[PDB]
Symmetry: C2
Subunit: 59 residues, 2 copies
């Protein structure tokens, strides 16, 4: 991979992990963050899809 | 807002900014990251929607 590709891939990994952490936090807030947790569940799946796509293309 | 809500809101802001940075990086790679940039454009819009939702609910 190029160095520029590696930066992007590392950032995609980081975003996937951050979105999981946020999902956990929103889930822990229960009813007080219910709709937000549902949006974040989708967000995390989308971050995972991006990471996988980068890995397959660059790697 | 609660302190737990503030943590979540701050994290949602951070993720929105990180996804924009990644989008810029993927766009700069042009054809070499085209599909990934298209996924990331959607990802950033979804992060913006999450942030806005948290802000309106917690704030």
């Amino acid at each position: 991979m190029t160095k520029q590709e590696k930066t992007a891939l590392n950032m995609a990994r980081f975003i996937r992990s951050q979105t999981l952490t946020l999902l956990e936090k929103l889930n822990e807030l229960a009813d007080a963050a219910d709709e937000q947790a549902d949006i974040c569940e989708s967000l995390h799946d989308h971050a995972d899809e991006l990471y996988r796509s980068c890995l397959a293309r660059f790697g």
